[PDB]
Specification:
Blueprint: H1 4-12, H2 14-28, H3 34-53, H4 64-73, H5 78-82, H6 93-102, H7 118-127, H8 129-143, H9 149-166, H10 172-203, H11 206-220, H12 226-244, H13 248-264, H14 274-277, H15 281-290, H16 304-309, H17 314-319, H18 321-334, H19 341-358, H20 364-368, H21 376-395, H22 398-412, H23 418-436, H24 443-464, H25 469-475, H26 482-487, H27 502-505, H28 510-513, H29 516-533, H30 541-557, H31 562-580
The structure holds palmitic acid (6 copies).
One palmitic acid (PLM) is lined by residues 207-208, 210-211, 214, 230, 233, 322, 325-326, 329, 345, 348-349, 352, 478, 480.
């Protein structure tokens, strides 16, 4: 490979190349119009083709990093539009590159993207499909500059699948909107999982991250030995350390070099990898990250022998504290894919601290004899929360379960703004739906993945706009305890009930005409303010109020003369409730 741009053109193919160069350029030049990018992207593709034809052609032996930067600096309004960024063009090539990385804006000043109508979309996607998908690719890329480029492309292909199906059906929107709903949420949850790996590698260090990865990998590849699991985690840490630094090309070669290792050492790792390992370069590492947990060797002993019973437990511990603890995590993790990673790290930390104490008594073996009884209540604490919430979710539907939850977290942190308590509680609802539809031995990992998502969003909405000490505690706490901390918030008895307001509890005929979506946000915003008004309110009482409201709204949506009902009855509701309390 004399020429890096030719080689890489051949292994992606023309179509994937153009789109990734679009995304790559969209992510730096976040203010130049869509049409400039089509010009850059055409020019660069013309140029790659040169190097496919003849690898000794002009400039083809320049590396990708030299090419990318040369191209940004040919931009005319770069001084005018980008300011500081134009100063990077005046340096040498081992500094120019890392200067462009430092001057990437995160979350610019762009207007938020309004999703157009189902018929305008289907028409546009019909009329010109490539300029419809790339403009929207360019649109989402410029707004999310730290979103890893080929996953953005992976999400783009799913967007394309959605339209190709549901625009070719005679009632388009009933098909289409529930698909675009999923993608919005999957894609934004992708953006925030990416956000979480980099913050925690920084915040919590490289040892925590490795503990987390040994755990996940051993649940994924229970038939691999500790040596190979150790060797996988070592190169991931390097990969994610290298990816979080932000240089796309450097990140992508790191992920490609591990994927290619995983597929050549496939018999040493897992039997579930054949399908992913026959994938084209671009899809490979994505596929490997998503592949399902292999089955654990059937003839597996107790952990008691190596980690409790044996002599040479403290001797093996002291010889290499972290190696010993990583063997524990591994062995415990590979017997329990039913656990969340976090609970496994709670158990590894529990074993850790007993040894610190017990290996430095005059008698260790009797001190830690009982260490496994200390796993009992840590195991059961997330199981009983999943038992309890999901049994509840089985009684009330999703919607009433979101309202069950809304009263719950409004009484614990009433100082939060009403729109936040709504977004978080409806969000939690959907993690109710999905995860309580799984079997017991597969629930705890579901909820872990979705809560970490919902709880990280929560915990920057909060560092932006703080409110409660207690919620600041959970957010600046260990990712290990972040969730139990939140589960341990009790009702706020320091809360002073807020001043009554009618406008809050006034309702106009517009409730009948809104969609179930926004019907529900309205009813729930009022539910929050209702509990904010009278926080010390019982849930026999609260059921009664909700009951009268249900009858009230239907009464006025099921009567001739709609608005006069709403004012007439609504006055009767507010006062009735104000005394029913
Ligand atoms: C990423 C590629 C998106 C292509 C579809 C654009 C139309 C959808 C508008 C934005 C949205 O709601 O996702
Ligand atoms: C000079 C041409 C412009 C630069 C080319 C665009 C850079 C985009 C890099 C995308 C790497 C995709 C490879 C997949 C690796 C993986 O995730 O396994
Ligand atoms: C390859 C070995 C990797 C790491 C092995 C050490 C296992 C650590 C077990 C305790 C969990 C540590 C969790 C981090 C939070 C903290 O304690 O500060
Ligand atoms: C599951 C029901 C979904 C309702 C919202 C989230 C409830 C969370 C309770 C279970 C906690 C999940 C385990 C996480 C951990 O091990 O720290
Ligand atoms: C801006 C910060 C707002 C804070 C609002 C707090 C809302 C609480 C959400 C808790 C989610 C974690 C799940 C806990 C499970 C449980 O209830 O046991
Ligand atoms: C001061 C007291 C004000 C009393 C006004 C009544 C507010 C009730 C708002 C919550 C309505 C619950 C509807 C949920 C449903 O049943 O779908």
């Amino acid at each position: 490979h004399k020429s890096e741009v030719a080689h890489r053109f051949k292994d992606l193919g023309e179509e994937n190349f153009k789109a990734l160069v679009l995304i790559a350029f969209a992510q730096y030049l976040q203010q130049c119009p869509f049409e400039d990018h089509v010009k850059l992207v055409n020019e660069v593709t013309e140029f790659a083709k040169t190097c496919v034809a003849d690898e000794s052609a002009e400039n083809c032996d320049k590396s990708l990093h030299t090419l990318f930067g040369d191209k940004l600096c040919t931009v005319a309004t770069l001084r005018e539009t980008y300011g500081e960024m134009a100063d990077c063009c005046a340096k040498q090539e081992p500094e120019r590159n890392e200067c462009f990385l430092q001057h990437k804006d995160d979350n610019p000043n762009l207007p938020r993207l309004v999703r157009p109508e189902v018929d305008v979309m289907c028409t546009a996607f019909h009329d010109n499909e490539e300029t419809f998908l790339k403009k929207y690719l360019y649109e989402i890329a410029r707004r999310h500059p730290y979103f890893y480029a080929p996953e953005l492309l992976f999400f783009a292909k799913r967007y394309k699948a959605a339209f190709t199906e549901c625009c070719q059906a005679a009632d388009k929107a009933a098909c289409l909107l529930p698909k675009l709903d999923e993608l919005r949420d999957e894609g934004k949850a992708s953006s925030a999982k990416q956000r979480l790996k980099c913050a925690s590698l920084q915040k919590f260090g490289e040892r925590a991250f490795k503990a987390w990865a040994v755990a996940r990998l051993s649940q994924r590849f229970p038939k691999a030995e500790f040596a190979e699991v150790s060797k996988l985690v070592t190169d991931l840490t390097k990969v994610h350390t290298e990816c979080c630094h932000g240089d796309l090309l450097e990140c992508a070669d790191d992920r490609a070099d591990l994927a290619k290792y995983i597929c050549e050492n496939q018999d040493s790792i897992s039997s579930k990898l054949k399908e992913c390992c026959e994938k084209p370069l671009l899809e490979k590492s994505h596929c490997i990250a998503e592949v399902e947990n292999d089955e654990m060797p059937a003839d597996l002993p107790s952990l008691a022998a190596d980690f409790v019973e044996s002599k040479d437990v403290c001797k093996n511990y002291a010889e290499a504290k972290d190696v010993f603890l990583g063997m524990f995590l591994y062995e415990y993790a590979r017997r329990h894919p039913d656990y969340s990673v976090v609970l496994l790290l709670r158990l590894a930390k529990t074993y850790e601290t007993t040894l610190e104490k017990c290996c430095a008594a005059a008698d260790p073996h009797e001190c830690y004899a009982k260490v496994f009884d200390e796993f009992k209540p840590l195991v059961e604490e997330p199981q009983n929360l999943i038992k309890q919430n999901c049994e509840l979710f089985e009684q009330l539907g999703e919607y009433k379960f979101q309202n069950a939850l809304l009263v719950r977290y409004t009484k614990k942190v009433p100082q939060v703004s009403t729109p936040t308590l709504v977004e978080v509680s409806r969000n939690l609802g959907k993690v109710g739906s999905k995860c309580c539809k799984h079997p017991e031995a597969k629930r705890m990992p579901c909820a872990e993945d979705y809560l970490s998502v919902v709880l990280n969003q929560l915990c920057v909405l909060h560092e932006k706009t703080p409110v409660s000490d207690r919620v600041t505690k959970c957010c600046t706490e260990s990712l290990v305890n972040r969730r139990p901390c939140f589960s341990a918030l009790e009702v706020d008895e320091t809360y002073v009930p807020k001043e009554f307001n009618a406008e809050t509890f006034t309702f106009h005929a517009d409730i009948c005409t809104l969609s179930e979506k926004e019907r529900q946000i309205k009813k729930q915003t009022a539910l929050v303010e209702l509990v904010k008004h009278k926080p010390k309110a019982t849930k026999e009482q609260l059921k009664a109020v909700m009951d009268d409201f249900a009858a009230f709204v239907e009464k006025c949506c099921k009567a001739d003369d709609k608005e006069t009902c709403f004012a007439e009855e609504g006055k009767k509701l507010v006062a009735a409730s104000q005394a029913a309390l």
